[PDB]
């Protein structure tokens, strides 16, 4: 835990298709 | 000054919530007007009222000392009446009734909270007009 997973990874699913 | 259609001190006779939790119907008689009665619906969670407390009741139009048509509050720095009243309602006078010789009753509805003011000579002042502010302070 205590990890900023969202900063580390460049999201793709979250953007609208 | 010249906007108070009526003002007098009243001594609350009784307060009863009839199956209500935030509105009580209080009854009061005028101190030093042997004929002026008052039946009034008060939101008591906003303005708590106890039996045998003296309330200064005032009826005014224009609390002041575009064609938008939606009511806009006066600004926070606006000097107005109600700056020294604890409780203020706005409603309409919808009925004047005769109860005897030289004794009349006036009915105000403040969105459904009714006021019945029994009196003798309040004619040149209390009109059947939307402009009716009820002001109450402890």
């Amino acid at each position: 835990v205590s990890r900023d997973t969202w900063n580390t990874k460049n999201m793709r699913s979250l953007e609208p298709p | 000054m010249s906007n108070t259609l009526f003002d007098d001190i009243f001594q609350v006779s009784e307060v009863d919530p009839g199956r209500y939790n935030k509105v009580c119907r209080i009854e009061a008689a005028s101190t030093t007007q042997d004929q002026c009665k008052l039946t009034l619906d008060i939101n008591v969670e906003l303005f708590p009222v106890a039996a045998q407390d003296s309330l200064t009741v005032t009826i005014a139009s224009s609390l002041n000392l575009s064609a938008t048509r939606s009511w806009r509050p006066p600004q926070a720095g606006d000097r107005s009446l109600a700056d020294d009243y604890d409780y203020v309602m706005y409603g309409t006078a919808y009925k004047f009734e005769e109860v005897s010789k030289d004794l009349i009753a006036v009915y105000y509805s403040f969105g459904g909270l009714l006021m019945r003011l029994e009196g003798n000579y309040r004619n040149l002042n209390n009109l059947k007009q939307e402009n009716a502010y009820l002001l109450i302070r402890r």
Partner: protein
């Protein structure tokens, strides 16, 4: 250049703005309620409320009436800017508490 997302309903619009209904497709209570809250947090806004006219359609109708200081469009744009800022503050605080832990 999305030309279908947010529409201005003209029958519900006044003269000179200051009172307008917007239709926002693919929106529901989620954005509607937060937007209404933020927009009511504006002094010039006298009226804000949304409605999903029918569950079958993914459509939201948000009504803004202002006083004369600004137009409904300006209040809407300000509401969206303020919602973005609020979510940014939430993001910063939450990521900081995650890092600290």
């Amino acid at each position: 250049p999305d030309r279908e997302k947010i529409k201005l309903l003209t029958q519900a619009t006044s003269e000179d703005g200051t009172s307008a209904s917007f239709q926002i497709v693919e929106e529901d209570h989620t954005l509607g309620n937060a937007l209404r809250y933020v927009i009511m947090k504006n002094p010039d806004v006298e009226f804000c409320g949304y409605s999903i006219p029918h569950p079958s359609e993914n459509l939201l109708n948000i009504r803004i009436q202002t006083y004369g200081e600004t137009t409904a469009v300006d209040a809407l744009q300000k509401g969206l800017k303020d919602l973005m800022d609020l979510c940014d503050v939430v993001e910063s605080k939450f990521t900081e508490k995650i890092k600290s832990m």
